[PDB]
Design a protein around this ligand. Sequence first.
Ligand SMILES: CCC(C)(C)C(=O)O[C@H]1C[C@@H](C)C=C2C=C[C@H](C)[C@H](CC[C@@H](O)C[C@@H](O)CC(=O)O)[C@H]21
Ligand SMILES: [Mg+2]
Length: 184
Amino acid sequence: DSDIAFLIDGSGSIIPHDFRRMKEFVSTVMEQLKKSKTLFSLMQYSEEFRIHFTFKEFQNNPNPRSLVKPITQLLGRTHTATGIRKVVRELFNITNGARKNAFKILVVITDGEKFGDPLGYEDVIPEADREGVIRYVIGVGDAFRSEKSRQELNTIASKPPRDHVFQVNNFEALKTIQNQLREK
Ligand SMILES: CCC(C)(C)C(=O)O[C@H]1C[C@@H](C)C=C2C=C[C@H](C)[C@H](CC[C@@H](O)C[C@@H](O)CC(=O)O)[C@H]21
Ligand SMILES: [Mg+2]
């Protein structure tokens, strides 16, 4: 009943310690939701974009370790808004294994410093709402330490922000998603 896509920040500002933590966060969400009706898909972005697995590819090989282990960090600039547009148009496409009546969830993992993107969040967030995608944001590094990055996380997340913005250092986001999925 639910299709969950990950969009993870592989840009130069993300230190390898945090990138590693993104990989274990994503893997743990998948591992915890195994034996459920959830499909998973993941894109890494910087100034380039890498689909590491589609929903269909997860369905054919639902092994979180096998799917996430070979992921290496892109480095480069931070095109978060374009990444969101590509997730919506490509990952949640039926050609890639996305399902018609599935509950759509996007989990964006970033430090909240979009940089060099020709697109603004105003260019892509409406499209995300148009396709019914629920957006959770997982902050990393110093995302919560300045007002600019805090507000950027809020801008990406579905409303209200306090229900959709979380940290990579814990699994509160997973608890919330599990609760949402249970209720739904
Ligand atoms: C891009 C060519 C340019 C501007 C001439 C240059 O000399 O560029 C330097 C100077 C500085 C002002 C701005 C830069 C922008 C991108 C380059 C990866 C580089 C490193 C800063 C960058 O690593 C900061 C991270 O935040 C990247 C990201 O995560 O988006 C850095
Ligand atoms: Mg960056």
